[PDB]
């Protein structure tokens, strides 16, 4: 239609800027990264945003609300993703044997 | 901290079905989630492989388990190589 073609345009053309993530990663490493790191790390974070919004619209469709996304559907989105191990936290030393 | 992903993330939520005009608080939650994800991946990458260096190989091992993200990384790298060859 005429909205699906505009939505497909924003699904492909949108990206995080490489001039800021290279500034963001290098503040964590200390020295330097490469261009093929920033190209991949800018691409995984678009999949991760698409992992949340496609699942936060499943929270909103499950409850009785409309397309505008309140933060109620967004804290619930991170809760359901973390219970399936999708959201990694490297500060919680987990233990499976008890 | 200011918001470094305020205008970029509003195009992306529209790209996955949200609205043309999302809420500022929802955009803020998404920006915080993206920063936390990038930080976690960078620490694990520094630990795995060459200590103190984050490489594409380390990032690929880290994302190997999740199918959607692994496929995207492989496609982007292959397309980048192809574009360099075309140039």
């Amino acid at each position: 239609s005429e909205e699906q073609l505009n939505r497909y345009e924003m699904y492909r053309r949108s990206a995080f800027p490489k001039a800021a993530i290279k500034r963001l990663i290098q503040s964590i490493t200390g020295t330097s990264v490469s261009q093929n790191v920033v190209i991949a790390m800018s691409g995984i974070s678009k999949v991760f945003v698409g992992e949340v919004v496609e699942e936060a619209l499943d929270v909103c469709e499950k409850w009785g609300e409309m397309p505008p996304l309140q933060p109620k559907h967004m804290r619930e989105a991170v809760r359901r993703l973390k219970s399936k191990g999708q959201i990694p936290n490297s500060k919680h030393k987990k233990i499976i044997f008890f | 901290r200011k918001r470094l992903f305020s205008k970029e993330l509003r195009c992306m939520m529209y790209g996955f079905g949200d609205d043309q005009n999302p809420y500022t608080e929802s955009v803020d939650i998404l920006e915080d989630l993206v920063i936390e994800f990038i930080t976690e991946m960078t620490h694990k990458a520094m630990s795995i492989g060459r200590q103190g260096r984050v490489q594409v190989e380390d990032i690929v091992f880290l994302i190997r388990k999740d199918p959607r993200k692994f496929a995207r990384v492989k496609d982007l790298l292959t397309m980048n190589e192809e574009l360099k060859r075309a140039r």
Binding site: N6, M10, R13, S14, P68, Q70, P71 | K7, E8, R10, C11, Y14, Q20, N21, P22, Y23, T24, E25, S26
Partner: peptide, 26 residues
């Protein structure tokens, strides 16, 4: 020179269509 000016035109239309009014929520 063609790659340098055309890169910012994919993002310039990404500030005219999406996000016209800024909302909030209780």
């Amino acid at each position: 020179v063609n790659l340098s000016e055309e890169s910012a035109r994919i993002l310039a239309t990404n500030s005219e269509l999406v996000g016209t009014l800024t909302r909030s929520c209780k």
